[PDB]
């Protein structure tokens, strides 16, 4: 086949469609105007082609071809530069497979997907309770004893029954969480591994799963034991003293890189729809966090592309920096 750059229909020295016939099969190489080269050109086909690229199915459908519509839309509707356009096309030309994803993650490239992190905590909580003066009626019985033979001697057990009745009109007592003291858990950074769980469909190739398991073990603070004991829960390997308490796991949930960011600024839903996880103060840059200490009482959100979200968790006026 051949590719001709600029379509001409006003060059009358050579008859239209004398040497080539437009038979394009590529989402990127859609040529609605070049179709007029072939005979039987009508207004209906042109009107249809102004919005839909004509691509044969016997040479690959758009849903079933590797190259799809959005890359064509990107290349046909972007006017920024050409070097940047070429590098963007190259970066898009990367497989989305788990091995490829591991490759980009170990490299440093940013795939076109984002994540959110959920971490569990356990805090020592104080409860503040006031009830009433006359909130409970408390009856007392008479003490009774049982002489029971024992090993060395005998056992005397003292028994006295009693009963309680709440002679209150409504809610007599109210108790609410008050104090925090030292956090018994850790505000650390430990990813929640998924290789512990079983039940999902395995890969048809064992070596792929084994390599993914071994690369997950590297760079993870909690990892499965190498012997992989069968008929068991696959407990994590023993370790030395964990720095400052029980580790807190962090799971990853994905979303597109462009997600409504001010949604994450306030107390939002872990799933994402009202149907809530408190976000504490976080920074997407090293600079943002150290400038979030109120250097000039100044808090910033976005500088160019990263983000700095304040605290919306109950730990607002706690945890001195």
């Amino acid at each position: 086949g051949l590719i001709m750059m600029a379509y001409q229909a006003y060059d009358e020295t050579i008859a239209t469609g004398t040497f080539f016939y437009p038979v394009p099969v590529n989402p990127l190489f859609a040529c609605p105007e070049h179709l007029a080269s072939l005979r039987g050109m009508t207004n209906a086909r042109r009107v249809l082609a102004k919005m839909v690229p004509p691509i044969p199915p016997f040479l690959g459908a758009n849903h079933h071809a590797t190259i799809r519509q959005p890359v064509a839309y990107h290349v046909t509707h972007s006017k920024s530069d050409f070097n940047t356009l070429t590098y963007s096309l190259l970066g898009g030309y990367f497989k989305f497979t788990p091995i490829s994803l591991t490759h980009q993650l170990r490299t440093g490239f940013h795939p076109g997907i984002a994540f959110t992190v959920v971490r569990q905590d356990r805090f020592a909580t104080e409860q503040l309770l006031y009830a009433e003066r006359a909130s409970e009626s408390y009856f007392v019985g008479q003490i009774q004893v049982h002489h029971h033979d024992a090993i060395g001697g005998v056992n005397f057990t003292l028994t006295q029954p009693r009963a309680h009745v709440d002679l209150g009109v409504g809610y007599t007592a109210v108790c609410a969480t008050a104090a925090l003291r030292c956090p018994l858990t850790d505000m650390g950074n430990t990813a929640q591994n998924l290789f512990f769980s079983r039940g999902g469909v395995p890969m048809l190739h064992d070596n792929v799963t084994e390599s993914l398991r071994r690369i997950t073990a590297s760079g993870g603070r909690l990892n499965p034991t190498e012997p992989l004991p069968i008929f068991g829960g696959l407990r994590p390997a023993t370790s030395a003293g964990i720095a400052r308490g029980q580790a807190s796991v962090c799971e990853f949930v994905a979303m597109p890189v462009s997600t409504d960011l001010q949604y994450f600024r306030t107390a939002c839903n872990p799933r994402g729809r009202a149907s809530e996880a408190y976000p504490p103060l976080c920074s997407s840059d090293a600079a943002m966090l150290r400038t979030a200490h109120a250097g000039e009482t100044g808090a910033d959100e976005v500088h160019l592309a990263q983000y700095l979200i304040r605290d919306a968790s109950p730990l607002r006026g706690c945890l001195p920096l």
Partner: protein, 575 residues
């Protein structure tokens, strides 16, 4: 009974009250007024009980005490130091008496301040209550980016600048910073996602396909979800009945074309494609029932089902979900120090691409040579004269289309046959291509191959052997494709019949332009013998296919911007 609207207003009231105060006492520890307000609210929030008493508990003065508050001694001390006021040390208590017991005034009523931790719960093996604990869920976004150009704004334009020409700030976010429980910096890197996303559970979509198969599926367009086979023809009447069927087989606008919607427009609840996006790696589309892909030319009509395919390209997600601005940002991030194109070469290439008056003589030569070294080996003078004449008349570099024509020029016509500017432009384009290839090599990890697949082909797509260039002139790439995998189930279809023959060295005596079978013209090798039973060998190394795919998928679309078209040739008229 304030019905739904006010019940939801109350619901939001509890929402904000919960969000505001769970650890208030340690929160506003430096604001003594707030604690007093909260205690006053708590004590003045429960209705009293029956006032019955024969002899009650009173202070030394005689005023009756009105309640008891229970905590631990820590908050006793923290309240008593400067927040609440001493009423007395002892009180009058019945015996069915003067006993030391603290008591504190709050609001307008007197209440005991009991923190009973010392008279009980020492040297006994029962744990103290009021030490319940709590389990809160914390939410951390990882790589959220803003698509809007207006949102790429700062507090001060010159906040964070460096000595580098490009700001090390345009790059999209890839890490999150927060504080440890002691105040030490903590960092999460994108490598940490492998604990969740890098498992085999990514391909368990069978359950979702089965579940979604049982919904209301109506008959829709079968253009983008159908694959056919070649009808064993010279590809002309094929296009004919394709256009005749295509012009009227549209039932409505395709669901996979309307990429112009933004995030908000695509996410509108009225969007029918809103429900057809389940997995980021999977494309869900409506397919006919009991149809084997590829099917016949006319799709059989039956109940439409749901079929899903894997997203090979990360950009296969719709451009509302993958912003063009983000793509440009990360593309700039990629080649920070890589080679760039000189303004001269880029202006010449763009001017010659957008040249509408481009003569068909170059197309004739490209079709006739058909990317064969034997053809190019005998047309040095004619090619030189043609390129010189076309160049030093409007300053446009030609012969850029066919990839098997530029490297031939830069190798053979490279000692000074052409003007210095033209060969410079060809060499600069080749430098950009090899810089792209080197960037591919940098971003992949070597030393890891699975099932006989090399790391380059395992990571990138343009380095993958299975995928092929839009146009192929020789059978070398096909041989590489159908030899490389050996685990990927192959199915090669050449306009009907399956499999190729690869017969080379065709002459005028046996031209046979009306050939319909699977004889593929591999072409005459230069440094070899044609023969008849000699096995077909690739004309070039594997890197040749890499360069051709890289050029066709990078240089051509970025410059043409979806204007150039691929098409066949009529040799029965050309020859």
């Amino acid at each position: 009974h304030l019905n739904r609207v006010a019940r939801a207003a109350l619901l939001s009231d509890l929402k904000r009250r919960v969000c505001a105060d769970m650890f208030f006492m340690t929160r506003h520890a430096r604001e003594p007024r707030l604690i007093s307000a909260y205690l006053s609210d708590m004590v003045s929030c429960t209705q009293p009980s029956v006032m019955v008493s024969r002899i009650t508990h009173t202070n030394t003065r005689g005023r009756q005490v009105d309640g008891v508050l229970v905590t631990t001694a820590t908050l006793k001390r923290q309240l008593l130091q400067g927040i609440l006021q001493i009423d007395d040390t002892a009180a009058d208590v019945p015996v069915t008496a003067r006993v030391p017991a603290d008591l504190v005034i709050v609001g307008d009523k007197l209440v005991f301040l009991e923190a009973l931790e010392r008279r009980v719960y020492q040297a006994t093996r029962v744990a103290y209550p009021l030490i319940g604990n709590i389990d809160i869920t914390f939410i951390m976004p990882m790589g959220v980016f803003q698509a809007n150009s207006m949102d790429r704004y700062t507090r001060h334009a010159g906040d964070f600048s460096t000595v580098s020409e490009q700001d090390p700030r345009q790059f999209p976010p890839q890490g999150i910073f927060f504080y440890n429980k002691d105040g030490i910096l903590t960092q999460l890197t994108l490598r940490d996602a492998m604990g969740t996303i890098c498992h085999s559970s990514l391909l368990d979509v069978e359950a979702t396909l089965v579940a979604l198969r049982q919904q209301h599926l109506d008959r829709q367009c079968y253009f983008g979800v159908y694959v056919a086979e070649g009808t064993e023809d010279t590809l002309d009447v094929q296009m004919g009945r394709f256009m005749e069927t295509w012009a009227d087989m549209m039932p409505h606008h395709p669901h996979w074309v309307n990429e112009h919607l933004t995030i908000l427009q695509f996410i509108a609840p009225s969007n029918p494609r809103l429900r057809f996006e389940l997995n980021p790696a999977f494309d869900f589309f409506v397919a006919p029932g009991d149809v084997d892909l590829p099917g016949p030319q006319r799709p059989p009509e039956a109940m439409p089902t749901v079929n899903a395919t894997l997203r090979i390209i990360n950009g296969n997600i719709p451009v509302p979900l993958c912003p063009i601005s983000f793509r440009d940002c990360r593309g700039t991030q990629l080649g920070l120090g890589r080679h760039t194109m000189t303004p001269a070469t880029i202006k010449a290439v763009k001017d010659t691409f957008e040249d509408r008056a481009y003569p068909t003589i170059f197309y004739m030569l490209e079709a006739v040579i058909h990317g064969n070294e034997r053809n190019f080996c005998a047309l040095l003078r004619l090619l030189t004269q043609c390129i010189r004449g076309y160049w030093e008349q409007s300053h446009r570099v030609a012969f850029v289309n066919n990839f098997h024509m530029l490297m031939y020029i830069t190798t053979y016509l490279g000692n000074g046959e052409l003007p210095e500017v033209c060969i410079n432009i060809y060499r600069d384009l080749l430098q950009h291509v090899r810089a792209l290839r080197q960037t591919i090599t940098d971003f992949t990890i070597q030393g890891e191959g699975h099932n006989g697949e090399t790391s380059e082909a395992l990571n990138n797509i343009l380095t993958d052997d299975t995928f092929i260039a839009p146009i192929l002139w020789d059978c070398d790439a096909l041989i590489y494709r159908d030899e490389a995998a050996r685990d990927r189930l192959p199915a090669i279809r050449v306009s009907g019949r399956n499999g190729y023959q690869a017969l080379h060295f065709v002459d005028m005596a046996g031209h046979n332009f009306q050939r319909r079978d699977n004889v593929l013209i591999h072409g005459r090798p230069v440094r070899g013998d044609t023969g008849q039973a000699i096995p077909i060998t690739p004309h070039h190394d594997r890197e040749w296919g890499i360069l051709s795919k890289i050029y066709y998928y990078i240089v051509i679309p970025a410059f043409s911007r979806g204007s150039c078209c691929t098409m066949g040739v009529r040799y029965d008229r050309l020859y």
